[PDB]
Design a protein around this ligand. Sequence first.
Ligand SMILES: [Mg+2]
Ligand SMILES: [Mg+2]
Ligand SMILES: [Mg+2]
Ligand SMILES: [Mg+2]
Ligand SMILES: [Mg+2]
Ligand SMILES: [Mg+2]
Ligand SMILES: [Mg+2]
Lengths: 216, 109, 225, 63, 51, 128, 124
Amino acid sequence: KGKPHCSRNPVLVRGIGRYSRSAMYSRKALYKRKYAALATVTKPVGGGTRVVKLRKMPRYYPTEDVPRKLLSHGKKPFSQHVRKLRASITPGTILIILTGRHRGKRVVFLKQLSSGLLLVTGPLSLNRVPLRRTHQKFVIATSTKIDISGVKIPKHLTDAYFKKKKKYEITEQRKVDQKAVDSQILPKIKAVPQLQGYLRSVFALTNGVYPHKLVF
Amino acid sequence: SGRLWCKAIFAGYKRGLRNQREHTALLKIEGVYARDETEFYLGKRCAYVYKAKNNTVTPGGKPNKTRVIWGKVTRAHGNSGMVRAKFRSNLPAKAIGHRIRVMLYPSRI
Amino acid sequence: NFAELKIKRLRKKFAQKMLRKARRKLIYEKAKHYHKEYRQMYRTEIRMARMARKAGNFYVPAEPKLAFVIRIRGINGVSPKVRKVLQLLRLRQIFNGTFVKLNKASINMLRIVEPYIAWGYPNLKSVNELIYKRGYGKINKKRIALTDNTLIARSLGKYNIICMEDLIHEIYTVGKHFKEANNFLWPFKLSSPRGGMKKKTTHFVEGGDAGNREDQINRLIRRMN
Amino acid sequence: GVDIRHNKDRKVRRKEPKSQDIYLRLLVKLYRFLARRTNSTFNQVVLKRLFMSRTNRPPLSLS
Amino acid sequence: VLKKNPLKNLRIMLKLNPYAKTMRRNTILRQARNHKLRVERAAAALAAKSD
Amino acid sequence: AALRPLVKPKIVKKRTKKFIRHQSDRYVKIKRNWRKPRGIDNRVRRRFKGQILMPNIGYGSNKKTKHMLPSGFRKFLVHNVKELEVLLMCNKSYCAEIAHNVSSKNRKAIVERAAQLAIRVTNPNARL
Amino acid sequence: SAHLQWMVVRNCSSFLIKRNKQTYSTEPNNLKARNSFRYNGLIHRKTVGVEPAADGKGVVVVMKRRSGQRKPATSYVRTTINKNARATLSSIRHMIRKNKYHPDLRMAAIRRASAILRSQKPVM
RNA sequence: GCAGUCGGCAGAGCGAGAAAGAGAGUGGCGCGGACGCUACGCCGCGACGAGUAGGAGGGCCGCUGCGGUGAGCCUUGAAGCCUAGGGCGCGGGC
RNA sequence: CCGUCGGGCCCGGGGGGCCACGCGUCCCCCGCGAGCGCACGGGGU
RNA sequence: GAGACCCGUGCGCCGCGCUCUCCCCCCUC
Ligand SMILES: [Mg+2]
Ligand SMILES: [Mg+2]
Ligand SMILES: [Mg+2]
Ligand SMILES: [Mg+2]
Ligand SMILES: [Mg+2]
Ligand SMILES: [Mg+2]
Ligand SMILES: [Mg+2]
């Protein structure tokens, strides 16, 4: 019986620990740790009692079948992938949505979701952008920021919450969640001057204004 | 409400003098006249928007006459800010000198 | 029965696992030893220059015993003596590279093929990355990539060359079995050199590419490899 | 471009009997398996001799 | 077998060369040691200007 | 609704245009079917730049998709009801095609048989 | 023997179809209808065949008998199976495997039983 | 390289740096297990690919006629011919 | 005598990394521990 | 992997090192 312990060497870089083999042998204390040396259900009938087999035979075989594939190793599903966020994106940053029906509009980033999508609202009282997901490769991260350390994001605002369902109406829960986040983040917006109008404005390219020259 | 793409010109195909490789296009982006300025646009998506006679379907919309060859920026071309781009279909040579929208959203910043 | 046959075959598997870990520890400690050999040669050469500079004399280094030769011209218009020496050097394409051990007989052959080769004296790093990136064996007359240590050790293991680091050590410190350890190697098929060329058709000392660029072959190896 | 001559790449040695004799071909089918799956070089010489022409298989007299 | 570069693939490099693990554990530990000695000396210079 | 193959790889073709015979546009007496040009001064044989391309073996298709239909099957000519049951086992990758001289009273029989055998027919509604 | 008869008929049989870069054998007991040595239904001492029954329901299985090889009248033994699909495949698998009767034809016969049974179940 | 599909007559090995035996003896419940193999077949590695005159190989390229064969096709429409139809083949062609 | 981040597993006497960590005898010298996972790991999910 | 004392992918080779079959302590929910 053993409660698990963390790995006794830290990560130096990826793939290599800090301490070597004999050092990790001492830190695991293996010098004092020498050690030495389903298919059938029986069911009654009315006869007697039968041995019923589960996993019964296939009634039909396809005329041709694909062979089983070779094994691969580094290939993980999307629920297990690692989540990279750009270091210019921090909680409370202002984003510019570039793609959807709210394109060019400026929004307040809050939290990265578990699928890597950026949970965001530039508030519905300013943008008409609700609590909504965006994508970091499709948003522009400007270096203007609001401190949202004291902001309680609800724990249920997840990707399962934000997933499309199947004639669309906002539910009462989605109505009250936007209020519950807006009533908190809006006094932080209005405590820095002109940012409410800045978020009300949209981003547009004009003559002579080039994106490789403009710093955001 | 306003423009969200950079202006570029289909300056020609990737070519030597007597051999043009139609699969790669040379873009001239407005405002980019040095190879140091090209680093923003590398990897960005580029669109040749054009109109034809028969209607085609518009994503998130009703069918109209506008049609798009999509593409993306691959690398810079020369010291003077010209850029190499690759499109899904090779761009028609009738578009040489005409406008390509360079979108902003393979964002890296 | 079969209960003793099963443990008899598991004993064979366990014995082979212990043999593999013994060979693994051998490869580890021998590469550890080669690291110290390289550092003793490097610091001994520096110290040998320093003790002569204290005394006011000159320390002449040993004339180099390993050359890396890159064929830089094409297969068109080659005079037959030059072509013969190039196929004896296993350079039958442009930008093929081989290691050559240096003596009078080899240097006079490189002297024949001076307009067609560019060569010089390779670094330990150049040998390392040449074997690691472009190293291909000649096993059973086929070009097998050096992906396993057993892939070298089945051919050169009888000369006590059993891993990539004996192979690199045998090539670098030009050893007793250099001919076998270099003929085992396929001639390296290097890329075009990145950053362009100075002048391919003239000698290196007259501002071009061909010839003996003495320790300057390593700069070329970074751009070709 | 590689400087190699291709005049003698293709070996001009028989891979099969030119005869369409099915009895000789069943013998060749036996000795292909034997010459491949045994360590004996006799089976290889037998298979390559089963390949040959009648002139390269001259008769053996009793004496 | 697909050839992977041991100069870019760490555990292909360790498969061919078990001592590369030790040589890359050192000159990362040694490099961090040298960098903190360098910043300790850079701080000692600006501290000695304050005497 | 339709009968699918066992697998559907993308059928990559190195060329899709046919290999036109040299100078078959300038004449009606020269049919479009390919002939190797064998003249001494011939630009197409000499492989000059910007000319009609000659067929090479390098143009040959992938062996996994050679002779494969765009549906993903490979066709087999069928002349009667009896020559369908050779495809009774090859049905997931090989399809049937009724020959052009099979009458309209027998095409019905071959189609209604292949519907039982789940064999895909390239031309089910042909004559009728 | 069987290999000799194969070296006779491998390219010169009347059951040979060579069309459209394919090859088929129209032989009565050829499972998969493939011109092969293994799937040939005439040249072996032991053959399995599977075909639909005389009436439209069921699968008849054919086994070649050991004695009268030169006697085609009493050579093949036919057995009609009209059960459910799982029982029919159980019967064919037990006829091939428990008898050790030409055992590499086991799932060729099983898949042919499945194909005939699917062809006998009607389309909507 | 593969005849090793060696299955309740079972035991599912033979890529592994180092000549040879997963040798054998005797004293001290539940009935299961993809594909394959036209062996003239199938599979795997590696290197290579210019071509006149010329030589050789493969043609499930094509025409006509004969000998066998397809319980073949066909007046519910053969040959031929036309076709902005669908396709296949590197191609001959289908 | 002097010098060597010299070579001797850095010969030998009085804080930090090591593919070093059973015992018993004789002399030399100063063959089968078990489980669980993670992965720069035998060619994309 | 089990194995003639049992019949289970229908994630395993090489190579790297993680925890548990020992005992304590600290820190955070
Ligand atoms: Mg020249
Ligand atoms: Mg460059
Ligand atoms: Mg070539
Ligand atoms: Mg030639
Ligand atoms: Mg010749
Ligand atoms: Mg001429
Ligand atoms: Mg040729």
